[PDB]
Structure formats: structure tokens, C-alpha cells
């Protein structure tokens, strides 16, 4: 085959350095087209003789004099004549056919002039539109991740083909130009038209194309100079900056950078750090080296209207991107098949960095609910996949995009955290530093990190492993899934097997290891840490560490550092339960949660009865801390979803009202009648969940608090008396208790809300009305652009659907208005998969299945488009719900009746 028909670049030519000049035109032409122009020179070195230059180019028109490029030799090298230049669209190449061969060791310069659309598409150099007062503003910014650098200028657009870049922006003279590096100096006027200015930037270090960034805008900054002279700036809309919304980001950035320089034993490798808040940046955040982009709600924080979870989100998303400024940007994985190592690593250490900035918050705990249990839901499926993918199976831009998923990020994080824990952090940090120093400004595979970690292991005598780092990690990276570890405490027998939530699932993906792992197993016996154990690649083993007397108990996987779930014989479970009932503080808070998370998953898998899982919630009446309650609430939301229209609900509600009342009472006092929030994040999180659980389960005292506060707000609209933390519950419950007075007031507040996060809470709360007529009127608003944003339409319908009373109304609304398909799937794709998912979520009867089939019977024209697969998922999901409800209804009913007094 011809090389220009292969998706991977040749290795015959390697880039040295680039000059790139970009010029966005932020005024459309007389047709509404926005464009940018560019000029580039790439200097590259011939490694092997070749008579063709293949470089990436996507959606660029060339206006170069002559052929699409001009080609020169560097110094006194001669250059062959160009035969022709062509664009090969499929593989996204510009191809320069030469009349002779380039010579090994010679350097060449290739110059081009080009232009592209400055589209509203979040790809390459693109435009972003937003409002300042009555004025529509347009800025130019970048998103190269993963294969879009080539959409802004021709380049060898693979991550290992690193080079230095000299960026120049030509821009309106009253706008600011930003790039990876500082400007060289002040801007100078463009001679052809001094309404434009030219900003040149300092040369980048040797770096990857996917990490380039350049931005032209009206933004302003808050700034700090670190003690080492590193300039730190947070950029945002002028009104956001003036409001002070960039201050929290500024506060944490300096401490995070310092943490990482030490953690990595490597100086921050750039002269400055810019971070920018972009309105409606749907990629969320991107780690461009020296110029990190964020969506506004991810970077900005308003103390007066934002909740604590909001603050947690800002500090961790910052730590994540900053983590990459070394791991990923300084040392770069050679190919997209190893993306998991890069994103998995940042997804783990974001908690470490953030913990440094907010050390009272215990942020490191949050990886357990946030990543470990989250990803275990999808990794406990037959349709999962290994972290590792052969490089030669990842070729196309679409294949590269598929690397960015939950497994890569969250299982990547879980597995790396497990690795650091079993090596110990000190030892892990030593291998990590060695890896970074050896490969700085270069590229690696995951085997390079293992090698450097093994070097650290081999240079000490304290930590001993049952095999090499690589052999151990191969079990966690070359095969999908994870084991359930089952202990029989009467014998100390211990077994492992591939855990699937569906006990009747057929696994057809084969493992080189037969789904056996090498497993690090910490344990606690009667509240005392035991010696660490390794389960080798065997189905069963035995150790006295896991053997108990019937007044003793043992509990494995302390703090859920290991990527596995744990089952015990029923006697040990009861002992654990007893301990949790009498003195819970003897079991680490994370394990108090684990008992709940694991047992509910085990019940789903038919490995324990559902009553055993429910039994594990009984201790919660004395539980004050966030996580174990969160575990219960996450595990029970499906029960609520299946049973909230059934006879099971009263007893469930009553049971939950019983469990949560003492916690509610506790915070009542602690908060001094809800006047002051608890001090640290976990306790604030616990209060939020307690209020939520209390109110939504009809605890009179909570309902009273909600009604009082909202009435107080209504009598004095400009002085909101509800703390941001509690708003979503208080607003929802108060609207639930009230009528059109409350609803119309909240709607008024929605229509004048300036801040997205307040508007979100209001939109969600309005769906909590218990008046059919208000909900139907609200549904009638969701398709009106004047009243509900397009981007918010399905979200709103979904919130209405989640109201038991709104369920039939939303479902009727969707069926009836479905012909908004030939209206929103040609103008703006309109997340239809989420809508179907949401409104059909509750379905658990044959009757509801029949409704869904009868509704589907409209394939005749219309179709479904983006949610065609989502409908099929809904039918499969309904069958699963039907079956689960039949198996569980009776047992669950009687357990709740039994335990609600």
C-alpha cells in the first residue's frame, strides 16, 4: 500500500522546529463565514531516504505560491524539486511528491500558507461566542486534543514527534493574545493594517502538537508571582474577574504547583502558568502546556452562590491538569493506546495535589466513591475491556477518541493508586522521579514506568513483592475486570474469581491469565492492622490471617486501596455488623462504606442475599460521616427507582426516616439551628446528604425547615437566606409542599439568574412540584428557547420524569412530541440518548415493556438517530428490571416492614 493511505506517519522524517503564524478573523464575511489565515515553516530532518513528504493537514485550504508548499534545504543542503502536492482527506494528509530523494542527515524547511474556517466546533483553532451585556462577543481559541493540531496548521501530528514551536498571533490590537509561552515583548502593529497587532511568543520546549494552545480574546486576569518567579494567572471574562470569581483558582494554583514540583522531584518546566475559564467549553478541561483551558463552572467560584462540592470540583480539576504539566506534557506517552496511563495517573494524583491545597478536607478519600466504585459498575460487565490495547489496533481519529473513557480514567486511577500503595508512596515517588528525569522532553510506554519502579524496588530491601512490578501489573492491565475475593473465616480459606454483576453473563473475551490476578490484600482484625498478604495467581489459598474465632472479625482491603471487592461467610458479616452497631469507629470510615458498596453489588450478583446488604445499612442510625451514608444512598437509589410507585415505598421511606433522623437531629444542634455550616468538607457533604435524605423521605422537621426558609426567601427576594450547600433540597422540598406561589416565584428567580449553577438548581427544583398542572405547564415550556435553553431542554424533561407524579406526564410528552426529531437532529444533535434513558429508567413491568415496544413500532420514518441504540438499551434494561423486581419485591417489602418498626 501507498504510505499516504496508512493512518500512521512514516518514520523517515522527523520534525525539529516550527514557526507558526495564525490570524483569526473574528468578524464574519458577507455570508456569515468566520475564517483564520496562517503561515507556517516546519524544519525537519531526513532519517531514511524518501521521495515523499507526508504531513498532517485537516480542513485547510492552501494559498501558497506555486504548489501547496515551498521546500528548501537548510544551510547548504540541496533540495529535490516538487512533482506535485495533494491532499488525502481520509488519512488527513498533505502529500508532497518529490522528483528525487531527501538525504539522511539533511535538514529541510517546508513553508506553507493556508486558511480554514474558524468554526463553532471546538476543534483545532475555533471560535467561541458569548454575551457581555447586550453585546455578542467572539473569541478565538484552541482544542488540539487529540488529532486536531493538523486542523490549524500542517504538522507531523503524532504525540512522539515532538518539536519546538515559535507561535505568532496576528489579532485586533485591543485584544489579548495568549499561548503556551510568554510573549517575547509587547505587540507591534501589523504594517499592512495597524488595526491589527502582532504578538510573538517565546520558543516552546520540545513538545507534542496536541498540547499547543493559542487564544485571542478580551479576557482579563488575576495574578500572582510565585517565589521562584513563576507567573501565575487566571484568565476569564472581564465581568467574571471583576466579580472576584477567579480568586479561588488563584489561591490553590501556587500550592498545587509547589506540591507537584516536590512530588515529582522536578521543577515546573515552564516560565509561567496561565489557566483560562471559557464559557461553554464542553471538553471540560484540557492540559495545554502553560495554557490550560477550562469550562467556567470548572475554574470559577462564587462564594455567595456556589456550594462546597463546587469548591471541591474546582480544586481537583485544577490539580488534575497541573499534574499533567509534568506527567503527560514533560514526559509523553508515545501513542494513544497508552492514554490510560496518562489520564489514569492524573485522575489519581489530582486528589494528592488538591489535598495539599485543602489539607483539612480528606480529599484523598473521594477517589473511592468517585472513581473506584464508579468504574467497577462498568468493569464488572462482560462488555468491558482491558486498560491496555495493542498500539497497532489504535489508528484512526475515531479509534483514538475511544481511548478516552471511564476505564482509562477511573480504572487507570484505581490501579495506579493500588500500585503506589503496595510499593509505598516513597518508593513509588522514587521510581516516578527516575522515570521523569530519564525521559524528560521525550516519549514512553507504560513498560518504561514499570521498569523505573522496578529499579526503585531493586534498590531497597524493605518492600518485597511476589513477582516483578510488570508481572503484577500485567494482571491488572492486560485483562479486563477485577476479582471478588471471598473469605471463609472458619478455615481462613480465600478465593478469587472474575466478578460480574450478572451471574448469568457469558464472558467471551479471553484472558491470557484465565481471569486470575495477583492481589495485594491488607486486612484489619478486631480493629488492628494485620500483616500484609499477597494472593498469588491461584483460585484458592489459605492463611491464618483470615481465620477467626467466632467472637473475632476480619475485614480485607483497608481503605479499598486494592481494585477488588470482598465477600465473607455469613458469620463474619454478622460480626462486622455487630461491631458497626456497637462501636463503629473501630472500622475505618472508608471500610464502613465498602461494606455497603460491596454487599449490594454481591447481592446483584447473587453472592449474598439482598437482606444481607440491607442488614449492612442498619448501623447508619449512629453514623455521622459522609461516605457510608453516600454508599447507602448510591446503592438504594435503584430500589427507590423500582419501588417508589409500589407498596414497598412506605416501609422504605419509614425505614430511611428512622435511620436519618438522628443525623438530622445531630446537625440541627451542631449547626446551631442551621446557622453555621460544619467546618470540613466531609462533614458538610454529610449534612447535605442528611438534609436531602430527611426531606425526600418526608421527615416532618426537614419539611418544616424547607418551608420556613423558602417562605423567608419569598418575603425578601434579594436576600437569599439559604446557604448554597442546601439550596437544591430546600428549593425542591419547598416547591413540593407549595403551589403556584412558590413555583411562580422560583420561575421568576430562574428567569433572572445570572449564574448557571443557580439556574440549574432552580430548573431542577421546579420539577419537584406535586401539582400535575404545574408539571404539564413546565413541560410545555421546555421546548421554548425563550424560557428554557436548548442545551437544557432534555435535562429539564428528565427532572420532571424523576418526579413520581411527573413520570407519566414526561413519558406522554416524549411519545407525543417525538417528532421534534426532524427539528433537533440537523440543527443541534440534542442528547436523545439521555432523554430515553431518563424517562424509561423506572420501567419495571411487562405492561411498561409493552408500552415501550408499542412506542418503538414507529420506525416507519422519523427513526431515532443519536438515541437509536439508547432505545434498544431501554428495552433490555426494562426486561432486567422486570426480572429483578419479581425476584426481590417480596423479600425487600418484608425487610423494610420488619425494620421500620
Amino acid at each position: 500500500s501507498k504510505p499516504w493511505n496508512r493512518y500512521r506517519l512514516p518514520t523517515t522524517l522527523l520534525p525539529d522546529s516550527y514557526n507558526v503564524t495564525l490570524r483569526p478573523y473574528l468578524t464574519p464575511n458577507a455570508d456569515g463565514l468566520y475564517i483564520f489565515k496562517g503561515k507556517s515553516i516546519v524544519r525537519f530532518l531526513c532519517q531514511e531516504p524518501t521521495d515523499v513528504i507526508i504531513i498532517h493537514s485537516k480542513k485547510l485550504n492552501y494559498t501558497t505560491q506555486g504548489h501547496m508548499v515551498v521546500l528548501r534545504g537548510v544551510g547548504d543542503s540541496q533540495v529535490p524539486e516538487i512533482d506535485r502536492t495533494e491532499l488525502v482527506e481520509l488519512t488527513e494528509y498533505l502529500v508532497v511528491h518529490l522528483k528525487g530523494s531527501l538525504q539522511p542527515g539533511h535538514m529541510y524547511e517546508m513553508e506553507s500558507e493556508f486558511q480554514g474556517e474558524l468554526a463553532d466546533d471546538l476543534a483545532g483553532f475555533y471560535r467561541s461566542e458569548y454575551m457581555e451585556g447586550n453585546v455578542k462577543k467572539v473569541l478565538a481559541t484552541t482544542q488540539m486534543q487529540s488529532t486536531d493540531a493538523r486542523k490549524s496548521f500542517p504538522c507531523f501530528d503524532e504525540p512522539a514527534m515532538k518539536a519546538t514551536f515559535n507561535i505568532t498571533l496576528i489579532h485586533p490590537n485591543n485584544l489579548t493574545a495568549l499561548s503556551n509561552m510568554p510573549p517575547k515583548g509587547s505587540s507591534t502593529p501589523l504594517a499592512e493594517d495597524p488595526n491589527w497587532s502582532v504578538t510573538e511568543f517565546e520558543t516552546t520546549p520540545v513538545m507534542s502538537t496536541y498540547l499547543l494552545a493559542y487564544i485571542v480574546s478580551e479576557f482579563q486576569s488575576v495574578n500572582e508571582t510565585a517565589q521562584n518567579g513563576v507567573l501565575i494567572r487566571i484568565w476569564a471574562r472581564p465581568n467574571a474577574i471583576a466579580e472576584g470569581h477567579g480568586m479561588y483558582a488563584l489561591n490553590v494554583t501556587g500550592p498545587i504547583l509547589n506540591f507537584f514540583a516536590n512530588h515529582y522531584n522536578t521543577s515546573y518546566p515552564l516560565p509561567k502558568s496561565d489557566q483560562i475559564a471559557l464559557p461553554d467549553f464542553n471538553a471540560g478541561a484540557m492540559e495545554n502546556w502553560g495554557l490550560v483551558t477550562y469550562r467556567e463552572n470548572a475554574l470559577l467560584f462564587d462564594p455567595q452562590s456556589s456550594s462546597i462540592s463546587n469548591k471541591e470540583r474546582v480544586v481537583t480539576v485544577i490539580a488534575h491538569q497541573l499534574a499533567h504539566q509534568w506527567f503527560g506534557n514533560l514526559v509523553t506517552l508515545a501513542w494513544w493506546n497508552d492514554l490510560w496511563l496518562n489520564e489514569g495517573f492524573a485522575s489519581y494524583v489530582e486528589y494528592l495535589g488538591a489535598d495539599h491545597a485543602e489539607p483539612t478536607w480528606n480529599l484523598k478519600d473521594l477517589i473511592v466513591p468517585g472513581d473506584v466504585y464508579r468504574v467497577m459498575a462498568v468493569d464488572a460487565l462482560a462488555s468491558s475491556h482491558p486498560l491496555t490495547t495493542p498500539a497497532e489496533e489504535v489508528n484512526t481519529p475515531a479509534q483514538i477518541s475511544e481511548m478516552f473513557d471511564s476505564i482509562s480514567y477511573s480504572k487507570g486511577a484505581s490501579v495506579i493508586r493500588m500500585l503506589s500503595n503496595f510499593l509505598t508512596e516513597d518508593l513509588f515517588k522514587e521510581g516516578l522521579a527516575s522515570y521523569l528525569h530519564a525521559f524528560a522532553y521525550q516519549n514512553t510506554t507504560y513498560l518504561d514506568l514499570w521498569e523505573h519502579l522496578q529499579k526503585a524496588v531493586d534498590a531497597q530491601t524493605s518492600i518485597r513483592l511476589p513477582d516483578t512490578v510488570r508481572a503484577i501489573m500485567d494482571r491488572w492491565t492486560l485483562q479486563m475486570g477485577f476479582p471478588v475475593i471471598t473469605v471463609d473465616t472458619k478455615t481462613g480459606n480465600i478465593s478469587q474469581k472474575h466478578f460480574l454483576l450478572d451471574s448469568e453473563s457469558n464472558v467471551t473475551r479471553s484472558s491470557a491469565f484465565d481471569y486470575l490476578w495477583i492481589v495485594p490484600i491488607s486486612s484489619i482484625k478486631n480493629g488492628v492492622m494485620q500483616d500484609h498478604y499477597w494472593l498469588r495467581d491461584v483460585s484458592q489459598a489459605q492463611n491464618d490471617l483470615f481465620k477467626t474465632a467466632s467472637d473475632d472479625w476480619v475485614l480485607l482491603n483497608v481503605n479499598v486501596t486494592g481494585y477488588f471487592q470482598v465477600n465473607y461467610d455469613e458469620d463474619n458479616w454478622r460480626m462486622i455488623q455487630h461491631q458497626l452497631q456497637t462501636n463503629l469507629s473501630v472500622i475505618p470510615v472508608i471500610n464502613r462504606a465498602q461494606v455497603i458498596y460491596d454487599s449490594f453489588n454481591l447481592a446483584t450478583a447473587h453472592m449474598v442475599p439482598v437482606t444481607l446488604a440491607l442488614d449492612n445499612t442498619l448501623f447508619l442510625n449512629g453514623e455521622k460521616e459522609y461516605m457510608p451514608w453516600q454508599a447507602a444512598l448510591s446503592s438504594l437509589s435503584y430500589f427507590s427507582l423500582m419501588f417508589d410507585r409500589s407498596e414497598v415505598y412506605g416501609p422504605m421511606k419509614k425505614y430511611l426516616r428512622k435511620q436519618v433522623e438522628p443525623l438530622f437531629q445531630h446537625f440541627e444542634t451542631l449547626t446551631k439551628n442551621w446557622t453555621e455550616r460544619p467546618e470540613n468538607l466531609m462533614d458538610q457533604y454529610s449534612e447535605i446528604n442528611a438534609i436531602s435524605t430527611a426531606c425526600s423521605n418526608g421527615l416532618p422537621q426537614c419539611e418544616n425547615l424547607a418551608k420556613t426558609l423558602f417562605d423567608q426567601w419569598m418575603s425578601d427576594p434579594e436576600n437569599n437566606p439559604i446557604h448554597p450547600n442546601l439550596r437544591s433540597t430546600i428549593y425542591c422540598n419547598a416547591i413540593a409542599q407549595g403551589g403556584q406561589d412558590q413555583w411562580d416565584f422560583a420561575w421568576g428567580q430562574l428567569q433572572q439568574a445570572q449564574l448557571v449553577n443557580e439556574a440549574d438548581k432552580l430548573r431542577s427544583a421546579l420539577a419537584c412540584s406535586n401539582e400535575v398542572w404545574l408539571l404539564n405547564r413546565y413541560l410545555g415550556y421546555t421546548l421554548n428557547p425563550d424560557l428554557i435553553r436548548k442545551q437544557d431542554a432534555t435535562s429539564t424533561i428528565n427532572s420532571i420524569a424523576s418526579n413520581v407524579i411527573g413520570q407519566p406526564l414526561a413519558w406522554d410528552f416524549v411519545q407525543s412530541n417525538w417528532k421534534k426529531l426532524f427539528q433537533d437532529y440537523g440543527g443541534g444533535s440534542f442528547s436523545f440518548s439521555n432523554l430515553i434513558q431518563g424517562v424509561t429508567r423506572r420501567f419495571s413491568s411487562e405492561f411498561e415493556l409493552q408500552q415501550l415496544e408499542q412506542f418503538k413500532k414507529n420506525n416507519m420514518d422519523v427513526g431515532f438517530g443519536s438515541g437509536t441504540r439508547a432505545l434498544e438499551q431501554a428495552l433490555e434494561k426494562t426486561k432486567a428490571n422486570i426480572k429483578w423486581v419479581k425476584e426481590n419485591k417480596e423479600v425487600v417489602l418484608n425487610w423494610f416492614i420488619e425494620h421500620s418498626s
Binding site: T316, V317, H320, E350, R374, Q630
Partner: peptide
Amino acid sequence: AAAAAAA
């Protein structure tokens, strides 16, 4: 891009 990773 991205992460964090909620709970």
C-alpha cells in the same frame, strides 16, 4: 483532557 471524576 479533563477529569477530576465525581462520586
